[PDB]
Structures are given as structure tokens and as C-alpha cells.
């Protein structure tokens, strides 16, 4: 509360570390469904069903332009990519399995890096 501060976790390397994690996700062989925005003009249903589209290139642009106020807002967008994927794809489909794999990949990097 006012004039009562909790000890400050060092966040000086957060930007660099999130960038490294994102690079690792960008270069994963199962990242191909998530590299660019889904084409809303070519994929029936996507625009109406998925209220907040998100993809790696969009996360990269936001990270590079100071649009994440902290590391948790970055993690929220990454998870949104995989949440959208689960909403729109069957678990037993190529894209569906890719999403599950990528989420697992991300969360271990996240824990190992920050927890």
C-alpha cells in the first residue's frame, strides 16, 4: 500500500528473454500455422468465431514496438494463439496437434526462464 513496497523483482532482462523465447517458437518446425495472421478473407468462419486473432508475427511487432507493458501481457498473447487454435481445430488434426505441441514447448521455456 501507500509507502509500503514489496521487494522488487528484477525485470531488466524481461524484454530480451521474451524475445529469445519468441525466436525459439518462431523456429520450431511445428510453428508454421502460427507465423502469420490467419487470412480472414480465405478462411470461412474464422472472423466471426475467433474474436481476438493473434499470431507470432503480430506478437513480434508488438514486442519490438513497446506494446507489452510487462512479461505477463506477452504471455497472454502467446497463450491466445494456442487458445484460438484449440477453439477452431480438432485435437486430431495437423494444426490441432501443432498447437498442443507449441503450447507445451512455450510453457516449459516460460517456467524455466522466469520461475
As a whole number of angstroms, the distance between CA 113 and CA 90 comes to: 31
Measured from the CB atom, is 21 or 81 closer to ligand ES1? 81
3-state DSSP assignment of residue 93 = coil
Q: Which residue number is nearest to ligand ES1 in terms of Cβ?
A: 33
Nearest residue to 59 via CA among 73, 45, 48, 49 = 73
As a whole number of angstroms, the distance between CA 79 and CA 75 comes to: 6
**Interface with ligand ES1 (CB under 6 A), residue from 18, 25, 31, 38:** 38
Piece of 9-17, 18-26, 88-96, 101-109 that binds ligand ES1 (CB under 6 A): 88-96
Measured from the CB atom, is 20 or 40 closer to ligand ES1? 40
Amino acid at each position: 500500500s501507500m509507502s509500503v513496497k514489496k521487494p522488487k523483482r528484477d525485470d531488466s532482462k524481461d524484454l530480451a528473454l521474451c524475445s529469445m523465447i519468441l525466436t525459439e517458437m518462431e523456429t520450431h518446425e511445428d510453428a508454421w500455422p502460427f507465423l502469420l495472421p490467419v487470412n480472414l478473407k480465405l478462411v470461412p468462419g474464422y472472423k466471426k468465431v475467433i474474436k481476438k486473432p493473434m499470431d507470432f508475427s503480430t506478437i513480434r511487432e508488438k514486442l519490438s514496438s513497446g506494446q507489452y507493458p510487462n512479461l505477463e501481457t506477452f504471455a497472454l498473447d502467446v497463450r491466445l494463439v494456442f487458445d484460438n487454435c484449440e477453439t477452431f481445430n480438432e485435437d486430431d488434426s495437423d494444426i490441432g496437434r501443432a498447437g498442443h505441441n507449441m503450447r507445451k514447448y512455450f510453457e516449459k521455456k516460460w517456467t524455466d526462464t522466469f520461475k
